[PDB]
Structure formats: structure tokens, C-alpha cells
Symmetry: C5
Subunit: 268 residues, 5 copies
């Protein structure tokens, strides 16, 4: 990664620090570790408070997608527990439930849900989902019609309707939550203040080290840079929880984890 390919830049700066210092006493400039000890601790504190604030954003993103699996489990569970014979209406409500997660992933992955929506639904309902400015929310609205048309039919009482209605709210905070994380990210004034302070601290660190470390400088400076640049790279992976990176959320595999449950909850 860019961390590792720029961890090399301080090694030459350390040897540059070694090969310099010969005109230092003429100019009259000296660089010790005491100001960088103060500065380094101040940076490591701010990097730590920035990392734990980022970790919660990773946890909050993780909890919202975990609730989807919980809500749809119980919703299909309640449909097979209150209306066990309406297995014709089971697979319709399920199909909307499957479309929401995929449309959620494609809405958070900024891709095209057209291909995945036609797989589960007749084309009539796919464009109806695509006709609104928020297709996922149209699915929640569409899921209500399959639940709502059963209310006036006398199959579910108004309480049994409200109890299943209370399971779309758990689903509704997820869409409203995942949409909220990607539009209000951690204020960029944060990562830029740390990467501007970490990189500039890492480059000027060997200039403070060879006055006390002499030739052992490149070994120590890189080990301190590696610690900061790795601790900083953690903040860069927590900011993309819905992306395609090598170490992100496997949302394609998580939509798969949700689909195999509901389909085994009805038929196969």
C-alpha cells in the first residue's frame, strides 16, 4: 500500500540526515528529540482519539447491516406463524425483502440494481421501484402493499398488522442509518490534520534522531513511522465500510447470507 511505499522515504531521509549535519555548527542549527517527544505524543493521542471515533463508525455501519438479517428473519417467521397457509403471499413479501437488501447494497455501492431486481420480481414492480428517487424506500413502501392488502382481507387483525409493521421500523432505521453514514462522513478536517501532522512528523523525525542516534537512525525512524503510518492506515479502512476493498464489509456475501435464510424459511 501507499503506507509501505512511503515508509521508504524516511529511510533515505535518515541517511540524508546522516550525510548532513556537517555544516550544522556553521549555520548553528540543532534538532533534538525533546520537542518531537512532545509533538509525537500529541499526535499519537490525536491519532488514537481519531481511530476510536472511526472504529465506532465501523461498528455503527456493522450494526445497521446486522439488524437487516434479524428483522427479515422474524418477519418471515411471523408470516409462517400467523398465516401458515398463505404460502402464496409468503414468497411475495420475501421477494420484496430480498430486493431491499440488494437495492440497499447497490444504493450504498453506487451501482446499478436493474440486473438484480429483475431476477426476483416481475418487471412491472422493478420499474416501480426505479420510478422513485429512492428505490430502496419504494421497496419498503411496496412491502407495505403486500402487508396492507392482507389487512382489509380479514387474515391479519390490526394488531397482527402493527406487530409486523413494527418490523419494518427496525428495517427503516437501517436505510435511514446507512444513507446517513455516507453523506455525513467523519469531518475531513480530521484525517487531513493527522496525515499532515503524521507525514511531516515522520519526515522531520530523523533530523531530530541522528544528533543522538548517529548511524542507528534509519532503523529507529522507520519503526516509529511504521507504527504511526499503520495506526493511520487503520483510519483509512474504517471510512469505507461499504466499499470493494480487500478488507471491507462483504456486502455481496452479506446479502447472500440474508437470502439463503428466508428462502430456506419458506421452501429450499
Amino acid at each position: 500500500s501507499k503506507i509501505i511505499f512511503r515508509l521508504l522515504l524516511n529511510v533515505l531521509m535518515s541517511i540524508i540526515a546522516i550525510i548532513s549535519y556537517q555544516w550544522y555548527e556553521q549555520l548553528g542549527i540543532h534538532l533534538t528529540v525533546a520537542p518531537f517527544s512532545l509533538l509525537g505524543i500529541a499526535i499519537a493521542i490525536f491519532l488514537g482519539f481519531r481511530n476510536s471515533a472511526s472504529y465506532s463508525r465501523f461498528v455503527e455501519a456493522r450494526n445497521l447491516w446486522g439488524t437487516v438479517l434479524i428483522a427479515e428473519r422474524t418477519l418471515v417467521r411471523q408470516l409462517r406463524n400467523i398465516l401458515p397457509a398463505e404460502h402464496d403471499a409468503h414468497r411475495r413479501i420475501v421477494s420484496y425483502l430480498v430486493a431491499f437488501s440488494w437495492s440497499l447494497k447497490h444504493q450504498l455501492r453506487k451501482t446499478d440494481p436493474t440486473a438484480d431486481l429483475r431476477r426476483l420480481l416481475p418487471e412491472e414492480r422493478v420499474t416501480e421501484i426505479l420510478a422513485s428517487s429512492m428505490p430502496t424506500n419504494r421497496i419498503l413502501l411496496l412491502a407495505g402493499n403486500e402487508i396492507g392488502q392482507l389487512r382489509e382481507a380479514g387474515k391479519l387483525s390490526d394488531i397482527t398488522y402493527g406487530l409486523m409493521d413494527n418490523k419494518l421500523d427496525e428495517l427503516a432505521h437501517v436505510l435511514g442509518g446507512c444513507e446517513r453514514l455516507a453523506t455525513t462522513p467523519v469531518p475531513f478536517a480530521y484525517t487531513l490534520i493527522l496525515q499532515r501532522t503524521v507525514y511531516l512528523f515522520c519526515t522531520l523525525l530523523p533530523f531530530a534522531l541522528v544528533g543522538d542516534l548517529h548511524y542507528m537512525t534509519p532503523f529507529v525512524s522507520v519503526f516509529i513511522s511504521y507504527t504511526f503510518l499503520s495506526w493511520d492506515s487503520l483510519a483509512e479502512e474504517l471510512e469505507d465500510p461499504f466499499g470493494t476493498a480487500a478488507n471491507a464489509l462483504p456486502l455481496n456475501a452479506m446479502c447472500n447470507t440474508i437470502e439463503r435464510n428466508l428462502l430456506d424459511m419458506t421452501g429450499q
Copy 2:
């Protein structure tokens, strides 16, 4: 944007051109007390920086709940009362006015323009004549829900479902007004911001013996770190304000209007 930190560069350079009075007026300023003082300050600045971010998160979570609540509320009307679009455009218009009137209550601005756009003048005067306009709007939306209670159009259960989502909006109002009135006492932030700069200006006075001519480079680089982690924390304690890293409340109310209006049909 900066606190003219260049003045510490002059304060660092002043120590250099004064350093000629080093042993004559008998001054020693070492790094250990300023390291102790500086580490203690960066420790105290770290706990405040995360604390302001938390106030920022609570405001965004409340505004996200607003988008979710009105999302679900307009949805519940479309599943139980599929034909009652005469009451939709009234309940929706009240819900949209709630968001705009809330933002103007937190910005201490005038909500007159946005209310006349969505509601009739006769009821706009009804809203503006009260000491709590948002709760009066939420109260007005309840009348449109209450007039739907009637006797048999919505069951006794079904009213409670919409009542259980108007209170979700009310816990937002009680919080957002609480965040805009419950901050750190404006005498404890003041003692903290003035302590950082006093460490910031006297830091080069102690760094000359160590960093002779390299003093302004480190003094500014430590100034930049301390003055930034403190000045950004001053942007997050008022997420309803006009700061850079503030909540762009204009665009969230705009996103809610485009949501409900796309739900009308």
C-alpha cells in the same frame, strides 16, 4: 483560516533576537516542564476533541431519525388509507414544515418564508403566534391524524402506530433544543483556549537552547497541531451553526422535502 500563528513565529524569532540577553538577565527555560505541561495539554485537548464530536453525532442522529420518522409516517398513510390523498397533502405539508421550522429555530433565523411556501396563511399565523412553532406544527399534524381517528376509518390500534411515530419526532425536538442550549460552560472553554496559546507562545522561549535557529519551524508545527485540534473542537460544539465542519442543515431538510414529495404520487 488560522489564528495568525505567524505571530508565534515572530514570538519564536523574538526569543532568538532576545536570546542575546540569555545569561545576562539570568533566564533558563527548559523542555521538561513544557513537555510535562504540553503532554498534559494534549491529553486534555484529546478528551475535549472526542467530546465535541459526540455532540456532533447526537445532532446528526436526531436529524437522521427525522428523515426516517417522516419516511415511515408517510408510508403508513399509504397502506391503511390508500385513497385518502386529500389528507395526505395536508399531513405531508405539515411534516415538511416541521423540518424547516426546526432548522430556523436552531439558527435563530426567521422561518416566515419557508412556512408560507407549504401551509395556508390562516394556519401560518396560527403557527407564528405561539412560543413553540415546531411543536405547534407537530400538534397540527396530529389534528390531521386526529381528524382521521373519527370512528372507523383507522382502527384504535392504527392510530397508536402513527402516534408512536410523532413522538419519535418529539424526542428529536427536545434533544436538538437541548444541544443548542447545553454546552460546556462558556467560561471553561475560555480558560482552555487561552491556556493553549500561552503554552504556544512560551514554547519557543524554551526551545531556543535546543533548536537555536530551527525554533520557528517546530514552534509553528507544534502550534499548528495544538491550535488546530482546539479550533476544530470549537466547530463541532455548535453543529447547528455556520462553521465549516458543521451540519449542512439546509441540504437535509431539502432531502426530506424531495422524499415526501416523491411519496405523494
Copy 3:
């Protein structure tokens, strides 16, 4: 409060004048042990300040819920029973009296005058004849909701909607009583106040070795930083007091009163 640092400059002034003799018993004082000691204090002073702030937030969070619960409860009355405006003015007074007695319960004041202002004396005398007066108000307001259920005006469902709004008010009482009756760091705060005062006074004795006569200039600045972070750290753990304390419940207790009265129509123009 302020002269503690003037005592600290004097400790430096004494430290300056009591160090030319600093050889009686062979003794030297360095800054490194006080850096470790000071950094450990800044770690512990930082963790103690965060605990006080949290109880301050819960005091605002619980008192913020007071505004919401009484709003939602009174608003619920104007959407289901808009014509029974006679029962509005009774529940409101209880909700207004609940907040006032809630403020009066935690400040250890006499709620008689504000209860005589808002309630008839028969309910004032019975409430003041109880030790837990606030819990009686929600119970008295609960009968107002129960009598509307027993008469046929509120269904078994709709009663439960308003009962869940008196419970939000009931969870407020038990929490505000919990923060004000068990401020747990009881008597153990002086782990820092006795250490900071002792650290700040012995600091110039360790600083006058490096900073000779310039010691008070730094000595007050490090003492000012620790003792100000300390006086702030114990101002927030009592979010119901006077002086600089940032909770002014009277303006919040009045605002809930003026809100429900403005939600019921108490400013008519003839």
C-alpha cells in the same frame, strides 16, 4: 479558589529563597519524577473530568425528556379528545406541578407555594404529607388518565399510549433521584485535589532547580492548568447546584409550563 496559585507563587518565592541552603541534608529535586507524577495526574485528572461531564449530560437528558413526555402526552390529548378541554387543564397542571415539584425535590426546597399556585390545596396538602411528593403527582395524574379509561372516552389501547408517556415521566424521576442521591465518587475526589494541591506546592521545589528565579512564572502556569482543570472537574458532578453550574432548571421548568399552556390555548384575545 484563585489565591491557591498565589500560595503557589509564594511556594516558588520560598523555593527560590530556600534553595541556597539546599544542602543541609544532601537533597536535590529533579523534574523527571514530577513529569511521571504530573503525566500520571493529567491521565487521572482527564479520566475524572469525563465522569463528571457524563452525569451532567444525563441531568440534561432526563430533564429534556420532561419536555418531550409532557409534550407528547398533552399533544396526544388534543388529537383524540379535542372537545374535552376541561380535562386538559387538569393533567397540564399536574404535568406542570410535576416538573416544579421535581425541581423542588432535588433542590430541597418547599414546593408549597408553586404547588398552591398550580394545584388546589387538597392535592397540595396530601402531596406535602408524603415523603416522595413527585411520585404522587404521576400517580395523581395517572388517575386522571384512568378515570378517562373507565368512562369510555379512552379505549384500552389509547390508555396504553398515554400510560407509556407517564412511564417516560416515571423513569425520569428515578434517574434524577439516582444522580442526585448517589454521586458515587463519594469522598474519593481528594485523590486528585489533595494530590494536585500537594503536587502544585511541591512543584516549584522541583522546578527551582532548573528555573531558579523564573520559577513562579512557570510554577503558576502549571498550577493554574492543573487546578483549573480540577475546579472544572468538580463543578459538573453536581448538575443541580447554584453559582457557575450550568443547569438553570427554573427557566426550563417555566418553559415546560409555558409550553403546555401554549399547547392548550391560554392567551386569548377578546
Copy 4:
């Protein structure tokens, strides 16, 4: 208490450090303070993260006993608004709610609740309570029958039963929480490491302080030891809030405030 001994033992090691200071400079060992700042700060960092772990557990312990206070209030209040005349059932559910608080306090103090059960309940029901595994859970089950025997007879609707039922679950989440705070203690595999890292640092610090401060080490070493030894000893009572510590929860007084409240809602 057991930190004044370590402080008295820490003063004695400093006097040994002075009278041995002349012995170990020939032995061929030298001791500076610089590792002890890193080690002490590393310990001072760990004492801060552990104190936050104990303090959070104490607040949760206090909140559960506040929740018992609130839930039984609402349950007694909900009973006085739906069945206000059923005072034959008032003193029965109140006694169950009161016995619940006491039996829980005896369950966390690991004593025998028989004595307070004969005071509040009929003796035959004391035999029934003691014949179960969890005595507290048997009490709330008894409170449910008094609500349950009122529903099937026609006095409580299916809805109004749930309104009071939703307040016994609030009491049940307390029992499992109070059970979790006790049955699942904070991970104490480090408390012994904190006994071993702090005292060995506190005792060996004056051996490193006698290098710079000659006679002033016992004055300084205690000020560093007392500050270190205080922050750890405070963490030892806050992680055990159901015991008989000086900061512990005075559970005796909480049951009294709960009983005197519920008794004040029943005409006394």
C-alpha cells in the same frame, strides 16, 4: 486501608535505597529513572483504562436498582389506575415487588432470604420460594399470577394485562443484569497483573529515585506511589458494587427506600 501498608512499606524501601545506595555502585549496577517514566506512564495509561471499566459497571449496578424502583412504581401505579378497587390484590403484588428487592439483595450478598420472606409473605409461599433454583425469579413469577388471575376472570383486558406485563419485564431485565454483574465479573486475569505491575514498580521506583534525589526519594516516591496506589485501590471497590465495601452500593438502604415507597403507595 491496605494501601497505607504498601505506603508504609514503600517508605521503608526508600530508606533501604539510601542505606544500600552505597552498596550497589560497587556491585556494578546503575539505576536511572528514564525507563520508570515510560513504565509508569504505561502503567498510568493502563490504570486509566481500567478505572473506566469499573466505573461503568458501578453506574449500571446503580441504574438497575433505580429501574427496580421505577418499574415497581409504574406497576403499582398501573394497578391503581386500571383496578383501583382491587386492594385485595394491591397488598399482594406490592409484597411480591418488595420481596423481589430484598431477595435480590440477599442473592447478590449470597445470604439466606428466609428471614425477610417470613416477614413479608405467608409461610407456605416461603417454602415454595426456597424450593426453586433462583429465589428471585420465583417471586416475579408469583407476581405474574396475581396479574394473571385477574385477567382470566374478566377484570383485565388482554391489552391492560400487557400494560402491567410490560413493567414486569422491565424488572426481569434487571435480575438478569444484576445476575450478569455478579456471575460475570470484570476480567480479573489482569487485576493480579495490576497487583504485580504496580507494587513492583512502586517498590522499585525509589531504587531508581535514589540516583537523582539522594534523601528526597521517600518524599517523592510516596507522592508517586500514593498517587499510583490510590487510583488502583479506587478501582477495587467500583468493580464490586454489590459487596460490603466503603463505596459499595448500600443495598440495604435501597430495599428500604423501595419498600417505604411501595408501602406509601398503599395507604401507609
Copy 5:
């Protein structure tokens, strides 16, 4: 203290003594200032890691505590609404106990076959085990048992709705217990911190032999053992559903759950 690598920290300390004197050449020197700053920088990051992992341990305990509480209240509501239908009692309890055990086997990745055959008929064990997420098949079967009491007219939908809210408390745990064991913090950080902690502990004695020649092995381990310990706790708290009996005793909680529901009948 099972760290055999803490003894490995001692060996370079004597090497540091025999080398400090043998290789001052070419200017390379190791002083204490960079490793003190670096050590504090690590101790800051190790503290933020333990509390983040510690919360993962706490969240794991609450999920199993909610399982204990949820099954309690569900049984409480049934003996207060249907005290006479004890023929149906012996069925639901077995599912909740089978759910409790099957959840522990799902997080421990062990075999629940015997645990289900003790409680359920072979035909229903074949139905549960011949499917994905057997715990959810148990809760779905437990839901079927509640639906038949509404369809029987024995439970109103209101009292049914009172009980339905308790299958979600168990389902939010299952979906929650699935979350803690499947997506922890990325491993690419576990090793870079294990490579940063162990490499810092081994390179410390080369930096300690300044004026600390003979006292080096005593301090290096006391700092390394202290560092190697505070990191090792975060490695047990990050996997609270793992093999470590000192992490979570699911056997002691699943049995404690069994002892309660079985104690309402004997």
C-alpha cells in the same frame, strides 16, 4: 502468564551487554529517548485497542444474558395466561433449551446433534439439522408453537403479541451473536500490532544498555512482561465465543438456562 516469548526477551538483554561493548563502531548507538516516546505511543494505542475489544466482550455477554432473560419472561407469560395447557408446556421449553445450546454450538463451531436429540424427536432433529442456521430453525419452530395457541383461540392476538415481542429478543441475540464472531476488527491489524509489540519488546534491551548495563534484563522483562500482558488481554476479549474457557462459559450459561426452565416443571 503462558508467554514463552517473554523468556525470549531475556536472551537479547545479555546479547545487548556483550554487543554494546562490541559494536560502537560506525556510529550506530541506541539511547533511551526514541524508545520511551515510541513506548508511550504504543501504550496509547494498546489502551484504545483493549477497550474496543473489551466492549466486544461486554456486548457478547449481554447477548447471552438477553437469552437468559428472554426465555425467562416467555415462560412467565405462558404460566400466567395458560396455566392448564401443560401438555403444550413440555414442547416449547425443549426448543428454548435447544436454542440455547444450539447457539453456543453455532458460535463455538461444534456439533449439537446429541444436544438436539436429547430434547427433540428424531424427525424434528433431522428437520433442524438438515438446514442452515439451525438455531433460527428452532426459533421458527418455537414460533409455530405460539401460532397454534392463537389459532386455538387460547391466546388472543394481544396476548400473542405480548409473547411475539420475546422471540425478537432472542432473534436480535442470534443476529447479534452472529455479528461478533464473524466480523471483528481486520486481522491485518492484529499482526501489525503483534509485529509492532513483539519487535518493540525485543529491540528494547539494545536501547537500554546505556548506563543500564547490568540492570538491563530485570527492566526489559518488567516492561516487556507488562506490555506483553496488556496486549494478551485484548486477544482473549476479541474472541469471547472462542475456545478459552476463561472467555465465555456457554456451557455454564446454557445449563443455567436449562436449570431454570426445567425448574418450573421439576
